[PDB]
Amino acid sequence: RDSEEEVLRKTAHRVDLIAKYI
Amino acid sequence: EEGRLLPAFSLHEVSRVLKDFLHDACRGFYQDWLPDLSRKSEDPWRDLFLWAVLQNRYEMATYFWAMGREGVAAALAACKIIKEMSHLEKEAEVARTMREAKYEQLALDLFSECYSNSEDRAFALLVRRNHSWSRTTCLHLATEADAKAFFAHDGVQAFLTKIWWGDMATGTPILRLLGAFTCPALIYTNLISFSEAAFLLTRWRKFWGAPVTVFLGNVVMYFAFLFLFSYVLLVDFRPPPQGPSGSEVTLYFWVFTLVLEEIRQGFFTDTRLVKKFTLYVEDNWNKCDMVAIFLFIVGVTCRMVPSVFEAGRTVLAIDFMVFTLRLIHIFAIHKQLGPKIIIVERMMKDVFFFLFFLSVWLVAYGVTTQALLHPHDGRLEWIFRRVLYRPYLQIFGQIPLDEIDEARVANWLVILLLVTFLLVTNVLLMNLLIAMFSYTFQVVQGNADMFWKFQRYHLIVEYHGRPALAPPFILLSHLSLVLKQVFRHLERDLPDPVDQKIITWETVQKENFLSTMEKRRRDSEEEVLRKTAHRVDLIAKYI
Amino acid sequence: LYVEDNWNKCDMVAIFLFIVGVTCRMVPSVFEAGRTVLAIDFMVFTLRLIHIFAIHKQLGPKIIIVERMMKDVFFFLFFLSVWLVAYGVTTQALLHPHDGRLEWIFRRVLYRPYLQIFGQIPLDEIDEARVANWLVILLLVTFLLVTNVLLMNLLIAMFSY
Ligand SMILES: [Ca+2]
Ligand SMILES: [Ca+2]
């Protein structure tokens, strides 16, 4: 869960969702 | 339970076990068999730190150390205690974590920080008497802890060097030093900077008090003694009734002076005599010196007994070898030479392994070959001589085919076996020596290089304790010291005011160090990422 | 500037040797010694030749490597002498306790370690059966092991480094 890669991917996904919503 | 000769133990047992772990540093703890409980302890933080480090709880021990004064002394005794409680660990798995305590790292990290600013204060810190740990200096505590990595620090070496030159220029050409040493007139002039008829006497004392000068003097005197002994052994040796001479007497008196100096070095440098004797046994060089003087004493008996004229002489010859080996110790000081001696000393597997590897093949080969060549030999000693000489001589080009080759007085088998030997031992010896030498070397590149520094420190302290007079002249300094005692440096510490400022300054340094460590922790890429992710998640949930 | 370089100094030593040697033709009696000086001068010039090699891409780095390795001379001269002189003293003490010549003892004690390395072992003067043995064998084994591993190895670790 704490793989830097996993953190990055989750972050990117959330940013994209926030962007599409906003 | 042994002292008898909810749990039953009390603070008395804690004090006793702390004494068992550290003799001089912390013996007095909880003297006043217990004290009134109503009384608060004189210094709490140290007690809590000890309690933490005993129960083997790191991340609390660090915290207790943080808000405790006089820290660089603590974080070293703590390493001593944990490293000690390794042979006392019942379970191996646990024994590993505590063996990974690395408390010493705090000592190094703090010492570096304080060394960075105001070094003239750092040295004062390094050898100040310690108020809490039963008034012992940091260096003694490092010795007892056997923290080599601490000695490896640059500040330690700088301080050691400052002591090494007495009161003189730190750096001075070796040739300029030799010139200042050989001719006292050059001393009066300012060949090299000198730290600050009476003026001439003080300059003379400043020159002869510096350790390096005593070192060189002992060197040259030892050379002198070795040469006189060699001359006596070479030509003076003569039949016991009419064989010793005045020169032999002078040599014997010289040896008496040497052994007296060694006893002084061993015993009068240490509460009990057994303790000092153990300290003396500790080092190897002291033991070699003991073997040397024992050999000399037993050899001296030769002059007394006519018949044993030759054997005792041989003993003396061996004693010469012994002294020649003694000479090696001197080399430790030099930056280049030392590491080589460290490397060759570390490589001690070769003796055992190779003695086996050579013997198992040589003895069997000799038995088989002597079985082939001459099946009728009735002499055990002659067979011993032959079977010893053959492998001893075949390596160095001495191959007597006049006794092995029927055409020159089974051959091809002997040739095949000798080829197998000269190949497998060849590749096997130098190669193993060398892989291990590199690795042993490489091991030495780190750990034995640290030892070299360790060895340097030991030598420095040893020469500091010596008086100016040489081995043959010690007969006056030891006598004068004994007379003064019968008639009647590092240890020195400051006053309340002066010291307190130092303590406070060190405290501030420790605080700055910790704040810096925290700041560096703040900028970890991991920390930035985590904070970013948290903020994004919060923003997402809110939006 | 001229003193700076080493090769200039070697050239100076060479011409000094030649100048002093040329005096041989003048003095009849010193006919041989000056000739020997000239012989040494030849060695000097032969060493001078090495400088030339610097240009070549391959050769040069080898000369650089051998020149950088100057610890060996001092360390090994000590390491050989300390053992050789003591060994010779002890062995000559054992074999012949009555030697009255300093120069003869010098010749013997010099020749023995100089020749034992290269297969010249005159047992006719060391072995009573061929005119204390086992001690000499043990010491020679200890030497031929510790100097062997110690020399090439140290040369080589340092050579690599
Ligand atoms: Ca000693
Ligand atoms: Ca030129």
Automatic annotation (TrEMBL), chain B:
Would you tell me the Gene Ontology cellular component terms? membrane
Q: Where are the transmembrane segments?
A: 207-231, 288-309, 352-373, 410-429
GO molecular function terms here?
monoatomic ion channel activity
A Gene Ontology biological process in which this protein takes part is:
monoatomic cation transmembrane transport
* Ranges of residues in domain Ion transport: 223-445
Annotated keywords: Ion channel, Ion transport, Membrane, Receptor, Transmembrane, Transmembrane helix, Transport
The main location is: membrane
List localization entries.
Membrane
Coiled-coil segments on the chain, per record: none
Q: What is this protein called?
A: Transient receptor potential cation channel subfamily M member 5
